[PDB]
Design a protein around this ligand. Sequence first.
Ligand SMILES: CC(C)=CCC/C(C)=C/CC/C(C)=C/CC/C(C)=C/CC/C(C)=C/CC/C(C)=C/CC/C(C)=C/CC/C(C)=C/CC/C(C)=C/CC1=C(C)C(=O)c2ccccc2C1=O
Ligand SMILES: CC(C)=CCC/C(C)=C\CC/C(C)=C/CC/C(C)=C/CC/C(C)=C/CC/C(C)=C/CC/C(C)=C/CC/C(C)=C/CC/C(C)=C\CC1=C(C)C(=O)c2ccccc2C1=O
Ligand SMILES: CCCCCCCCCCCCCCCC(=O)O[C@H](COC(=O)CCCCCCC[C@@H](C)CCCCCCCCC)COP(=O)(O)O[C@H]1[C@H](O)[C@H](O)[C@H](O)[C@@H](O)[C@@H]1O
Ligand SMILES: CCCCCCCCCCCCCCCC(=O)O[C@H](COC(=O)CCCCCCC[C@@H](C)CCCCCCCCC)COP(=O)(O)O[C@H]1[C@H](O)[C@H](O)[C@H](O)[C@@H](O)[C@@H]1O
Ligand code: HEM
Ligand code: HEM
Ligand SMILES: CCc1nc2ccc(Cl)cn2c1C(=O)NCc1ccc(N2CCC(c3ccc(OC(F)(F)F)cc3)CC2)cc1
Ligand SMILES: CCc1nc2ccc(Cl)cn2c1C(=O)NCc1ccc(N2CCC(c3ccc(OC(F)(F)F)cc3)CC2)cc1
Ligand code: FES
Ligand code: FES
Lengths: 53, 53, 535, 382, 382
Amino acid sequence: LLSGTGIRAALSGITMGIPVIGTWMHWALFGGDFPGEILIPRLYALHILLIPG
Amino acid sequence: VWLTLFFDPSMAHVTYDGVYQPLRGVQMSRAYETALDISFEVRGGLFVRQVHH
Amino acid sequence: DFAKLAAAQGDAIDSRYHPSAAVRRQLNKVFPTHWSFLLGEIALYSFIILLLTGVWLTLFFDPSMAHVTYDGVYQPLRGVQMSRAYETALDISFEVRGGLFVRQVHHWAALMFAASIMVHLARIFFTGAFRRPREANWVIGSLLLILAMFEGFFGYSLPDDLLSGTGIRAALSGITMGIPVIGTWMHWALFGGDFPGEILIPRLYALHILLIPGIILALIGAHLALVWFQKHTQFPGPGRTETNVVGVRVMPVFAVKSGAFFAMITGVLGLMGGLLTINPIWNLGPYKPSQVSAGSQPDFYMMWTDGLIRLWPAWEFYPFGHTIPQGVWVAVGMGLVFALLIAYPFIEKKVTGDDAHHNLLQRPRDVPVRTAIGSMAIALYLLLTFACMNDIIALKFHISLNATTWIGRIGMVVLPAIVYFVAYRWAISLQRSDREVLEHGVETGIIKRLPHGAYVELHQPLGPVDEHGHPIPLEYAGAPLPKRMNKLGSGGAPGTGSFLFPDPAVEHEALTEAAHASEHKSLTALKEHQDRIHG
Amino acid sequence: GQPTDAELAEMSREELVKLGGKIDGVETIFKEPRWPVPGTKAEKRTERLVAYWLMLGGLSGLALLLVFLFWPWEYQPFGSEGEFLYSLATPLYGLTFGLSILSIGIGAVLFQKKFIPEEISVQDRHDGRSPEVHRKTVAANLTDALEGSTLKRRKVIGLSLGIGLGAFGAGTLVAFIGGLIKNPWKPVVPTAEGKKAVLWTSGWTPRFKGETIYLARATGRPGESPFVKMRPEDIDAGGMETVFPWRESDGDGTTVESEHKLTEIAMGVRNPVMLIRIKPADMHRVIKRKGQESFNFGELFAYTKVCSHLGCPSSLYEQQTYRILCPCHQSQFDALEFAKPIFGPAARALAQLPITIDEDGYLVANGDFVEPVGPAFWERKS
Amino acid sequence: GQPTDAELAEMSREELVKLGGKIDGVETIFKEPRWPVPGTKAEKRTERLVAYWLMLGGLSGLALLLVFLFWPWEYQPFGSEGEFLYSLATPLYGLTFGLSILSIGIGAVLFQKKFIPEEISVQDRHDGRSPEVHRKTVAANLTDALEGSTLKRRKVIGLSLGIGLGAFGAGTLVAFIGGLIKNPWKPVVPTAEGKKAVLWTSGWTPRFKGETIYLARATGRPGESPFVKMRPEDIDAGGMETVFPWRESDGDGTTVESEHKLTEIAMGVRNPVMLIRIKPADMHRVIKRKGQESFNFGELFAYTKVCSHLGCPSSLYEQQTYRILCPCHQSQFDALEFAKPIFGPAARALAQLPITIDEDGYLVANGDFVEPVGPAFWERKS
Ligand SMILES: CC(C)=CCC/C(C)=C/CC/C(C)=C/CC/C(C)=C/CC/C(C)=C/CC/C(C)=C/CC/C(C)=C/CC/C(C)=C/CC/C(C)=C/CC1=C(C)C(=O)c2ccccc2C1=O
Ligand SMILES: CC(C)=CCC/C(C)=C\CC/C(C)=C/CC/C(C)=C/CC/C(C)=C/CC/C(C)=C/CC/C(C)=C/CC/C(C)=C/CC/C(C)=C\CC1=C(C)C(=O)c2ccccc2C1=O
Ligand SMILES: CCCCCCCCCCCCCCCC(=O)O[C@H](COC(=O)CCCCCCC[C@@H](C)CCCCCCCCC)COP(=O)(O)O[C@H]1[C@H](O)[C@H](O)[C@H](O)[C@@H](O)[C@@H]1O
Ligand SMILES: CCCCCCCCCCCCCCCC(=O)O[C@H](COC(=O)CCCCCCC[C@@H](C)CCCCCCCCC)COP(=O)(O)O[C@H]1[C@H](O)[C@H](O)[C@H](O)[C@@H](O)[C@@H]1O
Ligand code: HEM
Ligand code: HEM
Ligand SMILES: CCc1nc2ccc(Cl)cn2c1C(=O)NCc1ccc(N2CCC(c3ccc(OC(F)(F)F)cc3)CC2)cc1
Ligand SMILES: CCc1nc2ccc(Cl)cn2c1C(=O)NCc1ccc(N2CCC(c3ccc(OC(F)(F)F)cc3)CC2)cc1
Ligand code: FES
Ligand code: FES
């Protein structure tokens, strides 16, 4: 709940706010709207493999 | 790495049906269910994720 | 002003840093230009491709066994329960532009990784590249091959699938739970419970995207560091000795050709990923314990294991209230294989007693016993691998499945022996071919002698010629010999104009004279370097 | 034998390159330009050829960009116009990408082989036993670090440090691994005779006394009523059917409570069974096990599909020869005789499920497998 | 001045250490033993102290092993005997592990502060602008590699290589990314006015004309009937309830088809709304929004819970002040006046949902939001 609302605020809201490509970046990151079913696996890949690397 | 052996990243909705009574039959993403399992179901998992954070 | 900008950047780097010495040393390092020495590079290149592809697949794959109905685009699997992992693999194949291409090239790169590791191992072994300096590089290399095989297994085991699911069921479940002391305990630790345990695929994902790739990357770094600082070994040749490296410097030539080779290998991999279909999981229904197909094979790099199980004669043992299932055998056999692979160089130096610091490779023919052993091992591996295909071999090539099984069973003892004998005699025969070339020289057209009807091959000596016709015999020096006048300066001046039209005779004459003089200068430089080295 | 403090100013590029090779022990012998004769049109042909390979790579890269951006990708149902275009979407992606990078690599190789000057550089290999000065200095440094630290004189610290590290490492590895270690023989699965370990039970283990476990056929309907009651006449002579342990409680899959009991039955690794109707003329060729002489309901024999060797399903069935073949490792069991392995890796016979018919004539398990039904493990045959 | 070919044999450990330091430019100044006086019992006691710290670390590691193996871990339900033992299971794990490794580290620090000889070694720093010989040699090597390669002379080859590399890179990057790129404005959500993009719709968008979208309350029952129709009498003056767009088709979660529609309603980001009953005494204070003058059904006002700033729920509701507060960033909207932000980052009013009562007196949305309801984005307010 805490981390979920943090995602909602930061990632969703701010990315959607960016003028030119904000909505496009939001749909690419979530593969759709905020509750997109490919968010957590993508964050897992970014967090255990990509960013630590 | 330890946490990666017990964490399932997904939003696949599932009922907990686990040890922690205050969340039983409540729809949660598989990621939350596995976080709860690490905290409660795997020995030292609460300790490991706690020291990780 | 790109020249000025480059000079300024170099000055800034060399003022903040002081790498001029190190940069020069790594730019001047000499690497032999033998084709076989590029073999290992292939694996590295393919490895890189895997990483580049693997990352792409981690942004779209959801490891899980959460049961879900597809409800996707692929009509033939709709409303069918399946793991979220299989659903996301299907979405990658169909729902992501290029996702099918990316995962196909990923699987093709995994296969090329395995095959190129295997060919590189064949090179190192037959050439004795592991013999004294570099014995560790063989051990760390042998541990890379094992990790690569298991990594590919966990990879195609990753998208929960009928074929890969039955592969997991056989190997990871049955063999693991067959191990006597801790088999069930290991099985439950690995699966967190019974075979279809709800934690398998996420754990394999962790092992396959981060853990095993990380270990492989570290081991590859160590491997390349050792090769770089244990100057790469070389084949015997004119100017090549135990105490030098003859070849090309890194920057101008070796680096450009290595980069071009990486480009060509990734082009081959992309062409395969496009034109060739690998692992069409949509045809492989979602894994169900009650479902299976006839093929039911693993990728080639693991098929030998399966083949072993097929050919092992169903031997079990039943101690007091316990049973050692026949599956155990393959594990033991697997151990032996790796146990005999990682620890080979030490066995070689124990038997031969040859612990000297060898920087010059030796031709496989020059070591008939090791060449025979390697041929025997390759024969056993091929027999096991094709035994793992005995189902398909019997189907397509009409042979009774029992006949194929028994052919493999008898072969895994007979065929290695026949191959050992044949390879030993073949290596010795190659040695004798080289020795007769040295004694007599190359061969050419036949001539009928003037007075009588004698027919003589009209040989061509490679060294000083005795007062009479026959030459002084040359002594073998461990390097290949020319067995065709083809490959010497004979009949090698075609028109330099073009494929269609000539160039002016003056230009052709100048070009051919320049190439002819350049070949003399190269050969002469090698000869003077030889003489200075020895004397 | 001097570092060339001021001579470097007038040294040419070749002289400095030779000096660097000398510093590194790398002697470049026979560095020669590939085109010593200038103005020759063979050089121009070669240059155009290299540029042609590079241009082909570039055109193929542009084609990759265009085809990826603008091509009818996306799965097209079978028989729908435009399916052919999809079938060669990924093939075009790979064709263009691979051709582009392969042509770039070919052009680079040709430039290396035809323009970059040929060299036979030879380097000084100093492999092994660093000069004795370095070896002595390293040994002295390490021995000074050890002895000067006063260790090997403080036996009490020597032993206490080792004990501390040993105890700490034991505890830490224990903490790592104990999360994974699970007892395979923890009684978890309820059974008519009390909770039992998972491997002792399958979907056919009677959860309650006199529990009616129907051999339900697995009709592959999408989600609803996946398992249906079965009746003896459904399977005709020489027919095989995969059946599962369906209960009355495990109703059809409409409800959320259901659709998971049924999913559990489907995912039950040891649940599936194969019911085979032995041809009547062949009933005189049947051989029965000890304690399994009545597991067959007339000419109906229920044998576990899970192969006794490594636990793949033994799905393949051959009538007119009565051979249950497992496709994983090509093991044949004899169905006429108790399902004992007549060929292949398997050495234990398939477990025969007791069967009968209850009221209304539906086939129902007459009990549980008298032995565990998966692949063998250490704690078996006792 | 000379490599000391044979003198190294006679050099002592200290002499060789000095020679190694000289080679590396490391001068060890003031290296002395920490205990010059032998036999003193202060040395013995410091030895004992370091050993005590190490043995304490070892005992702590052994305690970690023992507690991890044998301690009443595992979740215990609140109130159950043995819950206290669990409550300090993880604390004990961490306590023992930390004491172990911390005490080992303390012992090591004390050893190197009490026994390892103290050195003030000083090293020669050769940082910056490597000697001129190395710089010019590197420059010569690189320039020979470049010019000798004959590039910057085959303009065609250089230009073709650049074009090919650029085109291939463009194609490959497009191939990587195009998988990610999804058109946010692809009409996917069906609507009574044709398929519309997601952000233009929510659970309150009428899927067909005259559709009855009930303001159903989210009773937290475990799975079954999580949403139940609602009646105006249920909300009492100064009361707020979260309501969702429950359709008649989206029946209770009893079946499998349902319990997924209901999950969609629950997980709809813009689906949740808050229905607030304005007190009658405060009714005269209500200020309405143009085009939303009749959205309130009597004294019931439906405002989206999703904050107009970054899309957090605005769950907090203050009666007697009528302040809809968002806790993500503490933004206050005036509920009495149309739900416009009167404090905090939010700058746009919460979208008001039209409401009314249908047949049987149940509260149903009187239509969709006249404006998009989530947080603002570029393509908004047109
Ligand atoms: C365990 C074990 C060793 C069992 C023994 C069974 C076995 C391997 C039999 C050999 C298969 C052959 C060669 C059948 C032909 C009939 C026969 C035996 C003739 C006598 C053999 C003999 C010594 C002849 C003298 C001359 C000679 C060497 C002839 C060999 C002829 C052949 C087949 C040469 C090529 C070798 C070859 C590719 C064999 C098949 C190997 C495999 C695993 C192919 C896999 C494969 C298959 C199976 C596809 O279906 C397929 C479909 C579409 C695209 C690709 C493929 C594909 O790659
Ligand atoms: C739909 C879709 C997503 C499609 C994309 C497919 C996908 C997912 C991934 C692949 C896509 C991509 C990005 C493909 C291209 C990959 C790539 C960067 C190719 C570059 C090759 C290229 C274009 C060369 C142009 C010709 C040219 C001027 C070459 C000279 C300049 C270059 C590029 C030099 C590179 C040198 C190189 C390969 C260095 C590798 C670095 C590593 C890891 C090791 C270096 C190294 C090597 C290479 C040794 O051989 C070696 C041998 C013995 C001891 C030590 C070493 C050692 O350290
Ligand atoms: C020198 C080490 C000395 C320690 C020996 C280790 C084994 C002794 C066990 C004896 C006591 C048994 C009764 C108490 C214990 C008990 O009842 O549990 C059993 C399982 O034993 C456990 O607890 C976890 C075992 C601890 C890991 C041991 C790892 C092996 C050691 C030998 C290797 C490291 C030592 C250093 C040597 C290597 C040096 C390297 C060079 C069964 O599990 P289960 O009944 O399902 O409960 C599950 C919970 O345990 C489970 O943690 C939890 O994950 C749940 O999954 C739960 O299901
Ligand atoms: C230099 C590059 C020159 C090319 C410019 C690239 C942009 C031009 C776009 C023109 C195509 C528009 C009409 C046809 C196509 C169309 O309608 O698709 C659109 C989306 O355009 C796509 O195709 C994918 C876009 C390709 C990735 C472009 C990434 C940006 C570039 C500028 C950055 C890399 C280039 C190198 C520069 C950096 C150099 C570094 C030094 C909308 O998606 P949608 O209708 O939902 O379909 C979805 C499917 O696309 C989607 O692949 C699939 O994943 C599903 O999402 C599906 O929903
Ligand atoms: C490199 C810096 C890293 C940082 C700053 C970091 C930070 C965090 C934090 C704060 C959490 C929250 C855990 C919780 O609240 O329970 C977390 C979760 C997690 N981390 Fe990382 N982490 C890092 C590296 C890694 C690495 C390298 C891995 C894998 C090898 C990893 C795997 C995980 C996993 C699987 C979780 C979720 C498991 C769970 O929450 O119980 N992390 N990370
Ligand atoms: C190091 C050597 C590696 C080998 C031999 C290997 C092999 C494989 C193979 C054969 C597959 C089957 C894919 C399919 O059939 O569709 C696979 C799947 C996969 N690999 Fe690896 N891989 C390697 C490294 C990596 C790395 C480094 C990553 C991530 C950075 C990665 C990520 C993945 C993912 C996410 C999948 C599943 C995606 C899917 O199947 O759709 N792999 N791997
Ligand atoms: C919002 C504050 C907040 N409130 C709460 C309430 C509760 C809880 Cl629990 C947590 N919070 C948080 C919170 O944790 N905030 C962390 C945060 C914020 C912003 C981003 N941003 C990455 C870049 C995006 C971006 C920007 C530029 C781009 O253009 C480019 F770079 F050129 F491509 C592309 C993307 C915007 C989002 C990440 C983390
Ligand atoms: C089984 C054959 C097969 N049939 C099919 C049918 C269809 C398909 Cl698609 C695939 N196949 C395959 C298949 O792919 N087989 C690959 C395979 C084999 C064995 C193992 N094993 C490694 C060691 C483990 C082990 C043992 C001892 C240990 O002890 C130690 F080392 F000391 F710790 C540690 C680990 C057991 C599993 C893995 C993969
Ligand atoms: S898996 Fe059945 S015979 Fe091996
Ligand atoms: S998230 Fe609501 S005020 Fe910002």
